[PDB]
Structures are given as C-alpha cells and as structure tokens.
Design a protein around this nucleic acid. Structure first.
Lengths: 165, 282, 115, 60
RNA sequence: UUCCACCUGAAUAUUCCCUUAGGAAGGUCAAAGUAUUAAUAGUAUUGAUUGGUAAAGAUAAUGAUUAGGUGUCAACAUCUUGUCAAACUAUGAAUAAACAAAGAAGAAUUCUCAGUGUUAAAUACACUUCAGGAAUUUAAAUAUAAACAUACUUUGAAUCGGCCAAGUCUGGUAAGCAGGACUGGCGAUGCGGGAUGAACCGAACGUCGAGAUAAAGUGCCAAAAAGAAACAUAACGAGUACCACAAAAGGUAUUCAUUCAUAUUGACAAUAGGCACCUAUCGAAUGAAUGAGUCCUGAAAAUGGAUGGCAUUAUAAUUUCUUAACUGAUACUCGACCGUU
RNA sequence: GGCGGCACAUCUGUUACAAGAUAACGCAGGUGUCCAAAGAUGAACUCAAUGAGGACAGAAACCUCAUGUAGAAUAUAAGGG
RNA sequence: GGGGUGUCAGAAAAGUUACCACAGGGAUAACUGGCUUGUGGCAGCCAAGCGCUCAUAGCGACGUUGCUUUUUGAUCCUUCGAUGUCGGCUCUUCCUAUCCAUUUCAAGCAGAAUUGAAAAAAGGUAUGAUUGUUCACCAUUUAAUAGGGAACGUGAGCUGGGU
RNA sequence: AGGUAGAUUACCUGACGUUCCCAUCUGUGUGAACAUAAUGGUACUGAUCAGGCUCUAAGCAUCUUUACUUCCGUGUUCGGAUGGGAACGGGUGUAUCCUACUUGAUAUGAACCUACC
C-alpha cells in the first residue's frame, strides 16, 4: 500500500546515473528544438523546478510549441479504456532529442539522392536508376556451394559427465 | 603502521571527475550557462559575449558566440598590437585596456560595415562621462555581453575599462556606470585614469622620494625616453590613430618536438631488459 | 513459435499443394466462400494479378511468386477432416512424440490422412 | 462482515472489448496556449491575405 | 411476480456518500440512428529509446559476518579467506512500456513569392492550409490480417457479496485460512473422459444421416489389441494426473554399474599337519567400498468396505517399445432440412 | 460484537511483480507545525574526518600545513538533489 | 480573503434494558461436523553420557522425522421461517496406543517379586465419603480395578443438581 | 610550438619520478592612487630585475583507476507448454531469450573557432 504523493516511488527512478551527478551537458541548453520534432521526456531530478510528472518519464513526444525558456511537448496518455492527448511545457533540461526516426531519415536521403539523379538522366537520355529496394524480414537463405579445399571437420558428440568438485 | 590511506582502488571506482575546464580552474560553468542560454524561440540566433581576459602582460578581448561544436570568435583585439598605434610601453593599464576595448569596437563595426552610422564619442573632453549607444535612424546598435571570467569585479577593475572603450567605440554593451574608475570622486577621476593619470603621477611622486626606487619601477620607461607628462597626450594619438585604421593586419611557422610517444615495441622491450637484468642481479 | 501449442506446421510438397487446392480449395468472391468450380471464376477473382487458371493458382502458391500475398489472401482456409494427430497425445511437441510444433517435411503424411 | 477490497481481475479484458479509443486528428492540431508572438504573426498574416482575397471578390 | 419461438448478451475496476445488506458518476451490455471514412490492430520484424525486477557483488559505496598471513599482548593498517540483505548496490537480463517505418488529406523537385516578427541589418531564421501561385515527375517507401471494415452518436437495462486453477507472491505452524500481480475458467455451461465431483483433461450445443477423430482406453461389468524386453509380486504389494496421504532411518533382501585388491599352476571356504602364520588336497572366481532402481521393516482409531467392483500374479500390475491395429464427443468433414445475417 | 487501534484526510522506503495501476488491523517511520529569514539576489569561502606540529591543553577547547567526491550541512520522518 | 466541519466532499446528539419488541442474517459469534495440528497424546532415527567395568539390560542429552483427533486453539464452509444446549442413570457396539487372564522372547532374571518387548480385542475390568461437576483427592476390595469413539453416543429414554 | 574561448566530460582522474621555454603563459618586483582584507597571503593596481623552481603542457612505468575487445558462459536467471517424474521439498525434457562478477589483450585522449611564433 503506497501513498498518493506526487513523487512517490522515486528512490531508483529519480536517482542520478552512477558518476553522473553535478551539472549537465552544455549541449542540453544549446540544442535547437523546432515544432514537429520528436523528443523524449527524461525528468532530471537535479532541477526540482518545473520537474515533469513521473508518469511521463521515458515517453516519446512531439514538439508542438516553442517558448522562450520552455519547449512544448505533446505525448499520448492511456486512461480507463481510451487515450487522451497531454500537452506539456518542459524546459530543455528535462527533454532529449529522440532518435526514433534515425533509420527513416536516412532512407529519405537515399531516395532523394536517387530521384535527384533521375532528373539528371531522363533529360540527358541515359537510363534512369531505380529506387532502393524496400525493407524485408530475414528471408530464407539460398543454395550455395562450400569448397572442400579449405574446409575442416570437428566431430560433435555428447560430453562425458565430469564433476566440478 | 597506522596509515588508513583514502586513495585505494575502491576510492577511484566511485570517483567522478568534474568538467575538464572547471577541473583546470578556467571556466565557471554555473555562470557560463546563464550567459549562453539564448531564448528557445530564437532559433540559432547568435548571442554575443565579450571575453575579456587580462594576463600578466596582455589584455585579450574577443567577441564569441557559443555553439555545440565549440566557441567561435567573431573578432579579437589584443593589446600587444598597441605599439602599432604609438603606445610602446604600459600595455596593461587602465589606459591600454581602454584602447584595447576601443580597438575591438571599431574593428568589429568596420568588419560588419556599420562603422559610418555608429561612431560613438571621440573627443578627450568626454572620455569621463557615461555613454551608451542609441538607435540610429531605425537600426539598433550591435549588442554584446561582458564576460569577466574568474575576475573579481571591483570598483576600479580594468575589465570595465575594456567595456568603457567599447561603448565609446559605438558598440552597445549593457552596463551600469557604478563600477568604472569613478563611482565616487567624479568624471575627471575616471577620465584621468583613462589617460594614464595614475601612472603619470606615480613617477613624479616616485622621483620626488627616491631614484633607485624610481629606476626599479620604471626601468624601461626611463630608457625609452617617455616623460611622465607625455602620457596624457600619447594616448590621445592612440585613440586618434585607432579610429582611422582598426582593420587588423596580415612565413613558415617553426615547431619544436617535445618528447614523442613510445611504441608498443619499445614499451615491451624495456620491461624485458628490466626483467632480464633482475635475474642478473639475483 | 508463440502459437506452437495450438498449431502444427511444416513444408508441403507440390502434390500436397495440388490436392489441397483441387479438393478443398475455395475463394472469397463478393464476401462469399465459393468453392473452385471453373477457371472463369478464377479469372474473375484474380484477373489483375495475372492468374487465370487453377494451375496458375497452384504455381504461385508453391513457388511463392511476386503476387503470393494477394493470391493467398483470396483462398479461404481449407477445412480439413480428422486424423490421428500424434503418437502420445497433442499435449507435447512432435519432437517428444506429440502433436504440435514444426513437423518439417512430415506434415505431408498428416495432411494425406486429413485431405 | 469483511469483504474483498479490490481486484484488477477481468479489467484488461473489459478495457479491450471496445478498445482504446484513439484521439482524432483534430486533437493534435489545437493551438491554445501557443507562443504569443507566433500567434500574433499568424493572425497578422491571415488578416492580410483575407482582406486581399475579399477585395478581389468585391471588385467583380 | 402469469404465453411461445428467434437474435444479441454481461458485472465484483475507478470517484464520492452517516458510506460497508444501499446509492450517484464511470466501465461491461442492448436497442435505435448515422458518416465514404486525417477513421484499423491485446500481432510479428527492423531502428533509436525508458526501466532496475530475476540474477550477480561482498575492503566495488551502506551495513552483516568467519578466520589466516605481513608491519609497527592487544590495537591499528594492509593482503587474502568463508558466508549474507524486502526497507544495500556498481553491472544487469527474459517478459514488458511508449515511438518511427511517408494523411492539411499519396510523394518529390524547380521557378516565383507575400505579412508579421527574430535580427546589428538581414536575401538567414520562425509561423502563416510545408502562407500563396505555376510547371515537371510521380501511387514508392517491412510482414500479416481487416468492407456485414472502420468511426461512432443517442437513449437505457442489469451489476460492482464473487469463487477456482497455477513451473506465482505476502501474513501465518498450517488450513478446503486471509489478502494481492498476469491469464484462463465456474458464476451464466450442457457434451465425451477422470467410477461419483462448479472449476481438472478434450471440446463449447439449430434437427439429423454417414465418416474419419480429441482427451483417454482395449481380462469381465464395458464399445475396443496382438506381440517384445525387463526390475516387481510368497504381500489387503502394484495399478487412470488435480485426488483424496506417508517421513527420517535400517536390512549378508534383490538387479545393474563404477572403483580397488587377490585371481595359477594355484584366491577364498572346508579338511589334515606344524586363533595369526606356512604345507597338501580341494580347483574358479573371491574379497572390499560406493552409487542407482525394486522389495521388506518403519506403518496404531473407532458401523463393515472400497485400485469403482469382480478379479490378476514369467499379469489382466509397473517402465519402455513394435505393428498403414482398434474403440470413441453435441468438437471436424460431406450431405439433407429449419431460422438469423 | 465489545475493549484496544485508526489501516477515516494524509507523506517516505519496502511488500510490489525493471511502463502505469496496485491488498491485508503487512513491516519501519511521519503530518495538523516552523521561518523578516530559515524568502530573493550578489560576492567570498569549503564541509566531516585523518596525519604532522604549538604553553597550560589531556581522548574532546584554539592555531598552521597536507590529504580530503561530500563519508558534513541543508528546521523536521524517510527517500531523492 | 478570513471565521469549519480532524467522521478531514463537510448531521447540531448520553446511557441501560436479565421486562424488552420488529424486519432480517448462517454476509456473523456461542454446540456438533469438515480443512489444519501450533498446543495436547503417542511413536521413531543418531549417539554425548548414566547405568560400580559397559553408549544401546533399562534410560537416553544436543539435533531431528512422523502418526492421532481422545485437550485447547485457528477459520467461519453447512444450519438464525430453531439439529433441544453440562453431568449422572440405563443399554448396545466399535478402536488398541493392553490393565488382567492365555502363549512367547530379554534382563544388571538364583527363588519370590518385578522390568522391556511380540501374538492376540473372543472374556473381564468394582464399592463408597466430598463436589452439579468432567476432573480431582482419599478409604477399601479385586486377577485387574486400562485408555478412548459412536452429532464432545444416548432429554417424543429418565433426572433438572449446574448453566 | 604557444595562448584565449570552448564542446565530449577520467582514453581527460590520482601517485612516483622526468623534458624544454626561442615567442606565449606562468611564476616574479612594488604598494601611491581605484580597490582589499586581522595579514599587499587572497583579491586590486603599477611594473619587467632576474627564473624555467613550481605550475601549464609533452612523454616513462608488467602503476591503481577509467574506456573498448574476446573469454567467463550459452553458465545464473527467464517467456510458452503435459493425464511429464517426486509423498513433500524442489528440480527435467521440448520450442526460445540469455545478463553479471572475474581473468586476459589494447589504449591513456579525440576534436572546434581566433591571434601570435
């Protein structure tokens, strides 16, 4: 049975990382957040003012508004049988640049590079390059040959039981 | 014996080193992040600082805005280039600091091309009174921020002579006129110190008392032929000759090796020689 | 693997694929589970997917062609008969002598008694 | 006459019958409590474009 | 608390109450009425994350604790050693949680481009239907499933005494005791099996015909089996899980295996001669320890009785097999008819 | 049931199961206050402890140097900073 | 904004009824029954010792494993539109963890008297002072005057001494 | 090569010693005035007589520490699932996921803007 305090059960959640006490980075306050970016709420206990609620720790959200000292973050919250939109204003000391779309962002660059070449080839007459192939799960491996000149054999059999004492 | 040394390996496992520059005693990170923090709704708009550092010989003044990759210097004005403007000796006074501060203000405005509409004050009669740049037509003055570093801000600290020169140079630096060489007495007390009044009165006092004391304190001043009375006018020309040409100035550098590292071959060989001799002694 | 206790699966032979489609095959047309009775009924359902005959339906399934997903989704799940599932019981893996799990190529023997 | 105090039994099953109602797209596009200057810029431009468009409609 | 058939079909969370045998908001549910619909997911994969549980550690931080060295009785240092923590922790899983995998309406590029504001001024930058406008290219960007899909709107019924299982936990000596996390069930549920049983196993039901099946069984009750090898059985011993009981310990009882010693021209027991020792006959296994199965003792309660009963005993018990053997549900397949959509 | 206690409004760690929620008259404790400074800001300094020294002075008084990651202090209970 | 409801979403509130009454309840106590067996009873394993010598004739510490429901506990599953709630008297039957008689083995068993153990539950196991007492403690007698169950056997069988 | 400002915040720390200063940095001289305190020790200001003595920076060492790599070890633990085995207690097999401590090898920084040599 717990109490209904605001920061209950934060002996390990709100503890600082091992050898990670003191001041934070400088890039934390220098990072430029823009509306539409993806951020991660990470309550920094070293800054007790404006500390977000413990339920949003680790949640990924979208920046919806930028204010002179605080960054607006919009995350999804789960309620009895529905989902509601939570709008928060969080100082940069508690948010972090999310890397959720890191894989997606490089695929857009790969396609945009190919598409930029297809406008350098069609008008000049050269055949146009195709778009990169789509991602697929690990497919069944095909048949192949294994050379018998650089191969070696090791037999496998159950091991005789040897005591550890 | 009874030692109880707190330096064991158990001490370093839990040990956490501070920031590198704070560990060096060069950067105050508690006040740095206050002077770096640009408003979030100003996306990558630079925030400018006046890094004023005074060494034992040279007064360094820079205009730097912070970035994640590092700190980028917009313009720097040292005091060792004052000999190019007539000031041969006394590069770390309340007077040379003013010239170093004024030189950066004129040098930057020239680089930005806004030196014709922002001119500040020039006459020596107005050197002692406060002046803050204002709006010209509808263009606001260039705005900076004072960075004194780890220097105590006294009532006559030289870091406010650099600030005073910049304001008279045409650059807006927010401040209050209660820490210049005045803040007491009157404007002429500040103006005279801007013109090396305290240095000029020192020799005419030191010479009155003793001669070896006067030679020890001002040895190179005597040799160079600088009379005590010429200090006041030798800085007016420096202020004059700075405003008409602050545009900086233009071989192969000479290097000196220091120790060089040791490769794993030499590192391992030395132990083998030490190990081999250990049996020769034993 | 997650649903292993409730399924048995393996790799089918071409003869197994043919008999399943010919005898127990059906299609979803207009939301109706109609059994395969003509190639015109197959041409209408899968005309745009380049499948007009039942042997084209079989070939796409066996070789896992480019349009497998669209072709496979049209086929309704075959309703098989009852057969001796296991040696011990269907409460253990086929490796232990049970009924569920991956039978590899031995699923054809079970399918033969079930089609 | 003591009773059982609380149980979560059959509560996730109840919640997934009519499942988690996601918010509509209109919920993410609200602009209440935004930046004051940003709001002023948007209103200033929307009034400029509206007046120009309504003037052309008036002429014809 | 009064007629029939058909269709859909629950609850024991959360908030408040002079509230605890009861009420209102809310959840599950039903019926009506809609929308071409930025309005699909109790799933898997790839990518970047969050956590501090299981584990692990023990002069790695906080505590607990067994000793042994070295240095200046003890002491204090320092190096080792044995064992620990729900209110200790460096490290840290498996399962999970929340994102992305192209909706100002399916992309991209080029040209042109305005209003505010940031700004030292901006041609940078911010917002403005990726302000706006015109051309060119274009349906591409993991898997799977989904149009009687998806999104709902309104009105409202009943209900918030619950109980059970567990490769789970806390209090307790323990309880068919008390209380919790996740799931599946009974309640609301019949059918085949466990003899009988609310929860166990199979599988959920319109009326039937025929067929393969499920759990599980094949000496008789009772539908259905034949063969193979073994440790059991001289005893109310063994015999269908949940399940309706048995322990520590002992045995020169029995089967198998490992290790060691003696086994030859001669090991043990026996006989005869000078209890140990040596001689001859006797001629093939002998002795010792340990482990794993089975058996016996350990094993005493009240009406007469319960592998279900009869009964079995190189089984008709037990453990494992072989044979394209068999038996069997209202579940599955095919066909016929009745109703809903 | 009574008597006892408040699990009746409430906070900390643990039970509690590495998202959220979360039981017992489960465990160890806590609240109905205190503060014109113990609020705000600026500046300077670094704490506990140990070693070596100095008259009384000793195991504990004050002074100096060195080591000193907070082992101190932060009104309070505990946990965080 | 303040004056407050501490039962803290906030009535204005002392007891006793054995003279008691009503609507209800096994949602809930007092008696049996059922799960458990801490507690009570009984039984084992080991061997530090006692037993003048001698761990095991007879006991067995420190540890440890079970059985019973004849005590008391723990729970609240059945009964609240009622299962007559202690003891005694009468009577039958059942268990053995046996008190006697019968048959046996062992002793630190010369005899006698005894002590430990096995088969065996077909037979027997008393009279009174005090107490409602179960229990207890006495005085006798006896081969012995054993321990318990049957809704804590037995109230349309009795008594009404207790409650 | 050095100095200012930094970002990563121990590959950057700590201990024992070592190498230059040619520029720069530092230590170094002084106390009249701004200003400073019990002390010109700090901070402040004025200066250049000497010095690489400490700083600072570069390197050494079977150096503690720290960061990567194999091994530990598919070991501990774990999700799913029996009419699987055991009187309990606890512990298989199957299809899966897989830490930690420890030991061994390597490294002891990389990198941005401005001025001057």
């Amino acid at each position: 049975p717990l109490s209904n305090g605001r920061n209950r059960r934060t002996r390990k959640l709100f503890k600082r990382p091992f050898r990670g006490h003191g001041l934070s980075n400088t890039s934390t306050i220098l990072h430029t957040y823009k509306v539409g970016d993806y951020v991660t709420i990470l309550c920094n206990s070293s800054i007790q003012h404006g500390l977000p609620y413990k339920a949003f720790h680790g949640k990924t959200g979208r920046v919806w508004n930028v204010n002179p000292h605080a960054i607006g973050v919009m995350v999804n919250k789960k309620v009895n049988n529905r989902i509601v939109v939570k709008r928060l204003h969080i100082s940069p000391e508690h948010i972090k640049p999310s890397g959720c779309q890191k894989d997606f962002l490089e695929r857009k660059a790969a396609v945009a590079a190919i598409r930029k070449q297809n406008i350098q080839l069609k008008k000049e007459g050269k055949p146009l390059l195709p778009l990169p192939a789509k991602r697929l799960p690990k497919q069944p491996r095909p048949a192949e040959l294994i050379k018998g000149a650089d191969i070696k054999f090791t037999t496998v059999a159950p091991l005789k039981f040897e005591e550890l004492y | 014996g009874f030692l109880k040394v707190i330096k064991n390996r158990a001490y370093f496992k839990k040990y956490q080193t501070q920031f590198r520059r704070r560990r060096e005693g060069k950067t105050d990170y508690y006040a740095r992040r206050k002077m770096i923090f640009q408003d979030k709704d100003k996306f990558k708009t630079p925030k400018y600082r006046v890094v004023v550092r005074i060494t034992n010989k040279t007064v360094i003044a820079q205009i730097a805005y912070s970035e994640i990759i590092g700190d980028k210097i917009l313009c720097a004005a040292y005091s060792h280039e004052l000999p190019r403007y007539g000031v041969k000796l006394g590069l770390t006074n309340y007077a040379a600091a003013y010239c170093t501060g004024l030189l950066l203000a004129r040098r930057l405005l020239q680089k930005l091309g806004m030196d014709k509409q922002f001119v500040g004050v020039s006459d020596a009669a107005k050197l002692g009174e406060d002046y803050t740049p204002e709006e010209v037509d509808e263009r606001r003055p260039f705005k900076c921020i004072l960075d004194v570093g780890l220097a105590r801000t006294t009532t006559g600290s030289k870091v406010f002579a650099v600030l005073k020169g910049m304001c008279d140079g045409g650059v807006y630096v927010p401040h209050s006129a209660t820490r210049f060489a005045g803040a007491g007495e009157n404007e002429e007390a500040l103006r005279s110190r801007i013109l090396g009044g305290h240095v000029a009165a020192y020799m005419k006092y030191l010479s009155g008392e003793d001669a070896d004391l006067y030679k020890k304190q001002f040895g190179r001043f005597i040799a160079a032929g600088i009379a005590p009375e010429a200090l006041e006018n030798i800085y007016i020309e420096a202020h004059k000759k700075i405003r008409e040409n602050p545009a900086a100035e233009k071989k192969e550098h000479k290097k000196y090796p220091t120790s060089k590292k040791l490769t794993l071959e030499q590192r391992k060989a030395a132990i083998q020689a030490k190990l081999a001799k250990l049996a020769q002694q034993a | 693997r997650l649903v292993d206790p409730y399924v048995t699966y393996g790799y089918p032979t071409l003869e197994t694929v043919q008999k399943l489609i010919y005898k127990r095959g059906a299609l979803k047309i207009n939301g109706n589970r109609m059994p395969i009775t003509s190639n015109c009924m197959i041409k209408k359902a899968l005309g745009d997917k380049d499948v007009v005959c039942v042997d084209d339906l079989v070939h796409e399934i066996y070789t896992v062609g480019k349009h497998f997903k669209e072709v496979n989704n049209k086929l309704a799940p075959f309703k098989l008969n009852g057969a001796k599932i296991a040696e011990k019981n269907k409460k253990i893996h086929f490796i232990l002598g049970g009924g569920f799990g991956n039978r590899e190529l031995l699923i054809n023997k079970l399918l033969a008694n079930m089609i | 006459s003591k009773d059982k105090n609380r149980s979560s039994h059959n509560q996730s099953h109840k919640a997934h019958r009519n499942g988690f109602y996601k918010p509509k797209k209109s919920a993410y596009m609200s602009t209440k409590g935004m930046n004051v200057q940003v709001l002023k810029n948007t209103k200033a431009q929307r009034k400029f474009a509206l007046a120009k468009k309504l003037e052309a409609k008036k002429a014809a």
